[PDB]
Enzyme design. Sequence first.
Site, PDB file in Angstrom:
ATOM      1  N   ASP A  78       0.736  -1.144   0.025  1.00  0.00           N
ATOM      2  CA  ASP A  78      -0.074  -0.027  -0.016  1.00  0.00           C
ATOM      3  C   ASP A  78       0.835   1.284  -0.033  1.00  0.00           C
ATOM      4  O   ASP A  78       1.219   1.578   1.086  1.00  0.00           O
ATOM      5  CB  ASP A  78      -0.869  -0.090   1.269  1.00  0.00           C
ATOM      6  CG  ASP A  78      -1.802   1.244   1.427  1.00  0.00           C
ATOM      7  OD1 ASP A  78      -1.827   1.814   0.555  1.00  0.00           O
ATOM      8  OD2 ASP A  78      -2.275   1.350   2.393  1.00  0.00           O
ATOM      9  N   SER A 120      -1.443  15.668 -11.858  1.00  0.00           N
ATOM     10  CA  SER A 120      -1.698  15.546 -13.275  1.00  0.00           C
ATOM     11  C   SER A 120      -1.864  16.524 -13.881  1.00  0.00           C
ATOM     12  O   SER A 120      -2.568  17.497 -13.686  1.00  0.00           O
ATOM     13  CB  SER A 120      -2.782  14.385 -13.277  1.00  0.00           C
ATOM     14  OG  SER A 120      -3.097  14.112 -14.559  1.00  0.00           O
TER      15      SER A 120
END
Length: 330
Positions: free
Chosen positions: A35, A199
């Site tokens: 994770d 992004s």
Amino acid sequence: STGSATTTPIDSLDDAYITPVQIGTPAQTLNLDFDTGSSDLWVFSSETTASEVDGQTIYTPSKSTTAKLLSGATWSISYGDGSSSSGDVYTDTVSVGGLTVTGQAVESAKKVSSSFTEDSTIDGLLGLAFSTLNTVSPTQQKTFFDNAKASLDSPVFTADLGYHAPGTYNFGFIDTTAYTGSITYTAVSTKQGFWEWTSTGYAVGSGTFKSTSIDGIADTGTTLLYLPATVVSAYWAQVSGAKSSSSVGGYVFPCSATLPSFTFGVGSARIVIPGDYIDFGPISTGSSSCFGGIQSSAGIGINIFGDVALKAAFVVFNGATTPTLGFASK
Ligand SMILES: c1cnc2c(c1)ccc1cccnc12
């Protein structure tokens, strides 16, 4: 040194990925959820409340000759999905695909919440976010990656998650045969303890790319792709019959639909998530309404590039002096 291990989807939907990890002496192999959105290495154990264990493989520290109880240390974690677990801490030898760390903090669960008990395939988590998020008290502990970093040939780990197929986590090296084209690197902020990046935008199917900054985290421990409401509304508007369902808890769409792809920007580069990756099957057994793989982050407070996005790319978690993230098509 390097390490290389196969990661496998836990089910037919790729809800999560498990990677075998060796703990203790002799080795006790547990299948852990790697994770990058958390920093605790915790396991189901001989100390976990009996009624909260249902099929998981347990770590028995009393059977490991290298296990040492970390005096007075406890841990307690609460995750984004509402799950929780807590317990005590040992230090022990931990190996991932040939890479060994001695003295790694292994957090032994005394209690786990219902969703962990209900997932018989996940024996625990192996946190790969920054050690600043580690919950061990009173002395915070380091992640497996942090402990191994100095010894690795290169201070990196890569995530290559498969779609309905096995994949790989590599430590200490970049496999140049695992991706196409080049790896584009992007800035990371470690202020929140996550592999947080920005992004450069998105496209829905064959549509026009929208240049817009989307701050989010690269999180292998989250199944879906969580993006701003405007972005997710634009995606689902391209799917006939799709709608946001308050009763289901997200966007749902007719199971008979063929989904468009979703592209996200990494600098000037583009990662294309095929439409089939966004289908998470029936909302309930036998239903013809299916759950979407792209959901709004409005209720979370942070955008999450979970497995839906990450499995479309070869992802480099660069733990250099200034950490960065690399993405390549594959
Ligand atoms: C992550 C989160 N929610 C889901 C899934 C994966 C898969 C199926 C599903 C069906 C109904 C509601 N949520 C989910």
